Write a protein that binds this ligand. Structure first.
Ligand code: C3V
Length: 115
């Protein structure tokens, strides 16, 4: 199966929008982590492949996904980075877990629809 750019965008953008609609839980994930500004300069020692919502949105808007699983992989890279870097008691970790619950719920019927 070949997926057209607008087909991926129409099917997947609502799932991304469901993540942005979570407050406060989307807030840590809206822009790329800036370790110096945020006071966490060890971040890139630990997270080798950063990912965030703004990057995923741009990739969806600019045809950088050819297959829905490439989009799913980037969302999960964002989640796995947050569970790797952050302590289990932290806001970012718990907010990541909430986003992963929302995403699992939204993405399943969409994958079924895409075939
Ligand atoms: C009202 N409210 C605001 C926040 C919030 C907002 C941002 C961060 C973190 C938090 C909070 F949850 F701490 N920001 C952040 C800081 C440290 C790390 S470490 C990591 O992996 N990430 C993704 C981040 C992100 C990025 C800038 C926005 C949560 N509620």
């Amino acid at each position: 199966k070949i997926f057209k750019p607008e087909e991926l965008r129409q099917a997947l953008m609502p799932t991304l929008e469901a993540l942005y609609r979570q407050d406060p839980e989307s807030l840590p994930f809206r822009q790329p982590v800036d370790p110096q500004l945020l006071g966490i300069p060890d971040y890139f020692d630990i997270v080798k492949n950063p990912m965030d919502l703004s990057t995923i949105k741009r990739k969806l808007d600019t045809g950088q996904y050819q297959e829905p699983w490439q989009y799913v992989d980037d969302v999960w890279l964002m989640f796995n980075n947050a569970w790797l870097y952050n302590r289990k008691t932290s806001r970012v970790y718990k907010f990541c877990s909430k986003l992963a619950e929302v995403f699992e719920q939204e993405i399943d019927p969409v994958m079924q629809s895409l075939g």
